[PDB]
Amino acid sequence: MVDFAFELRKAQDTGKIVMGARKSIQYAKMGGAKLIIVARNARPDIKEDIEYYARLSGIPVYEFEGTSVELGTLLGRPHTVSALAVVDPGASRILALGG
């Protein structure tokens, strides 16, 4: 099974990700990510904008089952992260979550 926590870290360390709602929306807009991940408690309008821009470009969106606190912690940050975009999956299987 594709293990979200492990593969996300592996993408972070061997590929390229960008963190936060601001950059995640930008990258969805420009068609410059391969997956957008949102925390379950991402702000409704931010979820909706991400889902919309990703749909325009054919970019899958995956909702992480935990909070932005948990997502931040997984990503090695002492702050919330409510969304991120995987630009390059590196050696990871993270894009399998896009279905």
Q: How was this structure determined?
A: X-ray
- For residues 31 and 10, give the distance between their C-alpha atoms in angstroms, rounded to a whole number: 22
Q: What range defines the domain where residue 47 resides?
A: 1-99
- For residues 71 and 57, give the distance between their C-alpha atoms in angstroms, rounded to a whole number: 25
User: How many structural domains is the chain composed of?
Assistant: 1
Give DSSP secondary structure letters for the chain.
---HHHHHHHHHHHSEEEESHHHHHHHHHHT--SEEEEETTS-HHHHHHHHHHHHHHT--EEEESS-HHHHHHHTT-SS---EEEEEE-TT--GGGGG-
Output the domain CATH number for residue 1.
3.30.1330.30
- For residues 66 and 60, give the distance between their C-alpha atoms in angstroms, rounded to a whole number: 18
| Data resolution in angstroms | 1.7
- For residues 32 and 24, give the distance between their C-alpha atoms in angstroms, rounded to a whole number: 9
- For residues 72 and 56, give the distance between their C-alpha atoms in angstroms, rounded to a whole number: 27
The two tokens of residue 48 are 């909706």
Cβ contact 71:24 at 8 Å:
no
Return the amino acid letter for 52. Answer: Y
Cβ burial of 36 (10 Å; 0-12, 13-18, 19+) is buried
